[PDB]
Design a binder for this molecule. Structure first.
Ligand SMILES: CCCCCCCCCCCCC/C=C/[C@H](O)[C@H](N)CO
Ligand SMILES: CCCCCCCCCCCCC/C=C/[C@H](O)[C@H](N)CO
Lengths: 251, 178, 285, 59, 251, 114, 59, 57, 178
């Protein structure tokens, strides 16, 4: 009951200590139907060159770590043919499978929350100011939450308790989420469908959802146990569609 | 290490080592020093042409209290070998989670423009490369050894075949009565 | 009368089409501790197309692998000398002196088959100061002696009467001689390795020479001639057929030392490279 | 007259041959090059309890 | 009977003075079947992002013009998503529709041969030498045939009469071809299937076919007729397939 | 393919002639790519344990044998407009694709003071 | 005994022969000299629309 | 056992008899721009006798 | 003109040129310099005997405003080649009218006393000659180039065949490795 296998394209993930799988709102990803479309040209569907697991770079979970976030898309814009299909079209559409891995021994302890937040609009550390995109995202590198109130210009207000959105961090369980409790499991898996108020959208302009990893119980260990404990993310697009082919944009 | 058992162990450890690559080698089942003296390699060196899929099994031989996850990736020919986990994640890969089951299989599928490749592989019939990276890292409690090792097994799938018999270059003599 | 015999062709398995998956089936998670090898195909780990495979495993069957001729012995003998033991060649029968066929045979513990034997004989003139003479065609005799038979002492010994021993007479300029031999062993199958002794006190002769005992071969010139001396060389070739083999073994890594033992010098497992990550770069402008 | 007719090795995407035996001993016959059987499970799956390959190996 | 329309993807070509359409050997392009495949991974098929008309840059037909050639592929490696799918895969496969346009008035004269040559292997102007790839191809720019014997190092022997292959140029009608006779028609169209000795191949290493445009009757005109007469090529891939996804190669 | 060989011998011009020589024998060995290469006429490699060879003696019919279609492709290629390296350089044209082995031929007698 | 009997090449304005195959491989058989098929339209008429030859080619 | 194998002989086409003509059929007018080679025989341009041709390719 | 494209063009022009002959050549499909290196000629030079009918197609490559008519004539062996249009009109001929269709076919029918002729033709197996003349002349309006050119294509009919294989005289070497 704890072993699982997931195959997509030419990639496969195995796990021996999984809890279950979260399907965001009971809805699996699927293609756009004819009585819900507005764009008229025939779309392209690569179907194995884009729908496969891509791995980002890892972060180091330390004894005093506030947490991390990524923005999707724009974290996969340099990933193979998914990124190339993003650069040549005006409209795109895709669901995702997210898989977070972190293993440790039976003498370690700690607890992480893994949550996906749709339309996570963030605020600036200067209240009479506006944010820029570098402070929101660094591609495949993670942004870091902070330990206290932040200051200075152009940075995002990132104290963990408010999650940078002006809410209580303990209520983020309203979104699709799982937990990694080091004594129970070593991986989390979330299946996210396409969620928007329009049927397709431009993938450079709009961040569809933010992935947050926040430790509630810090990492602890004793005399000569291993000190280096990394966390790794792996994401696979599903039912990917593109419309509006023209010359390649340049950021 | 060519005459010790250390030749068979792949080293891994705990701590922040994400930027370090675990291992990597070319896919040349009868040519590369890594594969040429195994069972599969020894059988292939009697032949000139081969074809089919190849299975690599990995086994974690650490303590029962150590946890970790790894990324195992195969890249097709046409580019240089990846230099980071972000590059390697774009090819055919699997994410291995260490647990009660100790072994994970990476299957290399036959992706080639010709029906057969040469056992004596050249640049025209190249087959790609394999690499391993830390997906999260190794975590252990107090009282456990920090360093661990991984072992790798190779075998052939049920679509595999060879042809064009020849003599092997591994045995030789300088006179009779040998 | 004519009888139709059917031959079943044997091809490899097709790969089937497979799509995305999200379930509790974990085909890629195994345990090697059981002694079991995983039976997973590409269609269990990635998405695949349907392919009809027409490849056949015909050249890797044991019969096609072993049914070729290989040299197993070479020897010399003279028409005129001052030794009278160099006027004929003789040797004990085995397949342990030429390393190629013997490494190929030692992939298995036990083997059983019939044999086809061919001989290739050549002659040449011995270096003398005065040359020039016409010599008639040379004839050669090959005799097989099973264990217990009398042994020739010279090239004029009565034993070449060959009343019951099988012999071959041959003359140069013709096709090479050939004959077939059945499976001749007091056991149910041949033995390539024997971890035992000859005496019940666990001493004496160790290993392979305890069990073979298959006779000898003697070869001579028939003419008894040639005031100017000549020299002949004979080579023997084996070819097994109607084969059966049991209990496969790992292939020999070290080089052979002699024909009696399995003695060896310690060798490495392979050659080295720069580091565990080394990659040769081949895509450069 | 004791003739055997069997198919020849061809490709895929007139083709048979004839044989007569001339000698009294079967050790004189030619090689059996057209028998292709296999039984790999003897070496790859020599376990007492069957392993399904979609199920875990243990537990 | 002279009017024609061709639609592919989001592109369309109309013509009012066409002769007919040549189908190379009576064979239309199609996808690879299961009893002829050797590569085992699932292939990608973009199907409208790659299968559409791309236009190259034009050449000027002058009174003394020897002719021009292009190499396919490698003339479409910077064209939209066809080029991007070429850069990320090891194996590719596609047929083509070629369309050549050249119009002029009823007071002009001239005749062009339009021919597609599979496996057009070329020779060096130094007979004790070897060719390089820059002398064989310049991407979307055309190479130029010559007027006499060429010399110097590293250039291709390109006198038009031998077509740079050691043959008679009047025999090139053995290949798929058409003619543009300025008094009759103003466009040529050739449909070429995939032709090779293996079912798929790498698209950077192997030139599948060469396109040659050779005038047999030079351009002529009188007192105040238009002097500028351009020629234009347009190519569309068909039934495009790719296999062997890895990181992008770099030339 | 059907392959035939025609072998002839002759005497080298020397001042002193006159000798009787026995019939000459010749060996032909085919080596597929990857096999060991002979260094001399007495090299161990003429054991021909797995390589196919022909032994022949002068005065007989010419030797002959048939070869099947041996190529890693579906058909032979007479022209190849491509390279060997993925960087569009290296070896150009026909020699990239053939790779079908070598032939070695020697005298077997090892003789003939003249 | 697996014998093939077929007609010989004669003129126009007793005539058959017999063959037996001796070897196990089809690459050992003799050449196929008596197969005469043609398909010239592949090279001489490779056009999409059919041309009648009594009608004009255009218009 | 004996098996009879049949061999189809392949000869060239016969020429048919043709007479005078005055009509709108123009077999001799073509257009090479199409890439098509004309399939005209002597019986389309002159008056011919009937010949039975026995030549083989 | 042996190494230029001008070798393929037949020149014609406007004005009074009726007394001038346009072109003429012998019918020797494997012997004459005019036919020996074409496809049909190259195939015939591997053989010794040929038989059948031969198609010649002519295409006019002038402006769309030029008009004219030509006479294409084939004479059988037995006499000298014609010296005027009146002589040439007595053999097998066709009158070509230039218009919307650009091409006209002259079919040379097999007229011979033997079933086969030699590829290496002698006086005994001669086949005749072909000639072209102005039937009316070329007429153009103002603003058009006066000179035009004609091209000629050759091929074989569906009653054509060859026999008696031989080696070709067009390829040769002076040593191995060539
Ligand atoms: C004089 C005419 C006959 C020539 C005598 C040849 C007979 C040779 C005896 C047959 C021995 C064949 C089997 C022996 C081979 C070994 O068993 C193998 N190395 C495996 O044990
Ligand atoms: C020693 C006994 C066997 C003798 C060895 C002869 C084997 C020769 C190898 C077969 C090669 C035949 C096919 C090669 C010819 C080329 O493909 C053609 N030029 C067209 O590519």
């Amino acid at each position: 009951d704890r072993v699982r296998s997931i195959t997509l394209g030419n990639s496969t993930i195995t796990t021996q200590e999984s809890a279950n799988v979260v399907v965001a709102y009971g809805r699996w990803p699927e293609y756009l139907k004819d009585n819900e479309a507005t764009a008229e040209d025939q779309p392209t569907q690569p179907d194995v060159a884009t729908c496969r697991f891509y791995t980002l770079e890892s972060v180091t979970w330390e004894r005093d770590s506030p947490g991390w976030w990524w923005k999707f898309p724009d974290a996969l814009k340099d990933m193979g043919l998914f990124g190339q299909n993003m650069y040549y079209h005006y409209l795109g559409r895709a669901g995702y499978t997210i898989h977070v891995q972190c293993n440790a021994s039976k003498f370690h302890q700690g607890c992480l929350m893994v949550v996906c937040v749709p339309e996570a609009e963030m605020g600036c550390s200067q209240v009479d100011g506006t944010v820029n995109e570098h402070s929101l995202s660094e591609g495949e590198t993670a942004k870091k939450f902070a330990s206290t109130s932040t200051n200075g210009t152009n940075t995002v207000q990132s104290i963990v308790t408010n999650a940078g959105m002006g809410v209580g961090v303990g209520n983020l369980t309203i979104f699709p989420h799982q937990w990694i409790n080091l004594r129970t499991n070593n991986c989390a898996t979330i299946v996210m469908p396409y969620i928007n108020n329009v049927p397709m959208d431009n993938m450079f302009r709009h961040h569809n959802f933010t992935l947050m990893i926040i430790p509630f119980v810090p990492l602890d260990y004793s005399s000569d146990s291993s000190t280096y404990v990394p966390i790794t993310v792996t994401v696979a697009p599903m039912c990917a569609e593109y419309n509006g082919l023209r010359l390649a944009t340049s950021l | 290490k060519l005459d010790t058992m250390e030749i068979y162990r792949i080293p891994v450890q705990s701590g922040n080592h994400q930027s370090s690559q675990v291992f990597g080698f070319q896919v040349q089942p009868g040519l590369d020093n890594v594969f040429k003296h195994t069972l599969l390699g020894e059988i292939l060196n009697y032949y000139a042409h081969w074809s089919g899929s190849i299975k690599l099994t990995f086994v974690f031989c650490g303590s029962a209290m150590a946890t970790g996850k790894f990324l195992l990736a195969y890249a097709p020919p046409g580019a240089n070998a990846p230099k980071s986990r972000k590059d390697a994640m774009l090819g055919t890969h699997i994410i291995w989670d260490v647990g009660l089951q100790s072994s994970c299989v990476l299957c290399i599928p036959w992706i080639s423009q010709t029906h057969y490749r040469l056992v004596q592989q050249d640049e025209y019939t190249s087959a790609g490369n394999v690499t391993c990276w830390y997906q999260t890292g190794i975590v252990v409690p107090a009282g456990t050894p920090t360093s661990c090792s991984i072992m790798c097994f190779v075998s052939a799938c049920n679509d595999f075949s060879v042809r064009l018999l020849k003599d092997t270059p591994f045995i030789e003599q300088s006179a009779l009565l040998q | 009368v004519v009888e139709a015999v059917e031959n079943a062709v044997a091809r490899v398995a097709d790969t089937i089409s497979s799509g995305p998956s999200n379930s509790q089936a974990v085909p890629a998670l195994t345990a090697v501790e059981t002694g079991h090898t995983s039976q997973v195909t590409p269609s269990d780990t990635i998405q695949t197309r349907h392919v009809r495979n027409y490849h056949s495993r015909s050249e890797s069957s044991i019969e096609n692998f072993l049914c070729r001729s290989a040299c197993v012995y070479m020897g010399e003998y003279h028409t005129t000398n001052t030794d009278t033991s160099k006027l004929f060649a003789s040797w004990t029968i085995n397949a342990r002196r030429m390393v190629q066929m013997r490494r190929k045979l030692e992939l298995f513990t036990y083997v059983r088959f019939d044999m086809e034997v061919t001989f290739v004989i050549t002659s040449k003139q011995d270096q003398g100061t005065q040359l020039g003479q016409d010599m008639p065609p040379l004839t050669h005799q090959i005799m097989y002696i099973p264990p217990g038979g009398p042994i020739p002492k010279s090239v004029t010994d009565y034993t070449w009467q060959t009343s019951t021993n099988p012999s071959i007479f041959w003359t140069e300029g013709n096709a090479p001689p050939r004959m077939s031999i059945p499976f001749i062993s007091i056991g149910n199958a041949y033995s390539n390795f024997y971890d035992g002794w000859s005496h019940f006190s666990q001493n004496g002769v160790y290993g392979y020479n305890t069990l073979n005992h298959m006779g000898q071969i003697y070869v001579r010139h028939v003419n008894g001639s040639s005031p100017l001396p000549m020299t002949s060389t004979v080579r023997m070739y084996f070819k097994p057929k109607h084969v059966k083999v049991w209990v496969p073994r790992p292939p020999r890594l070290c080089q052979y030392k002699n024909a009696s033992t399995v003695n060896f010098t310690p060798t490495n497992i392979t050659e080295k490279r720069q580091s565990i990550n080394y990659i040769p770069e081949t895509v450069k402008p | 007259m004791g003739a055997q007719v069997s198919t020849q090795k061809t490709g895929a995407h007139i083709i048979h041959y004839t044989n007569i035996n001339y000698y009294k001993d079967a050790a004189s016959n030619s090689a059996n090059r057209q028998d292709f059987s296999q039984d790999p499970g003897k070496f790859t799956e020599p376990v007492k309890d069957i392993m399904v390959k979609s199920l875990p190996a243990l537990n």
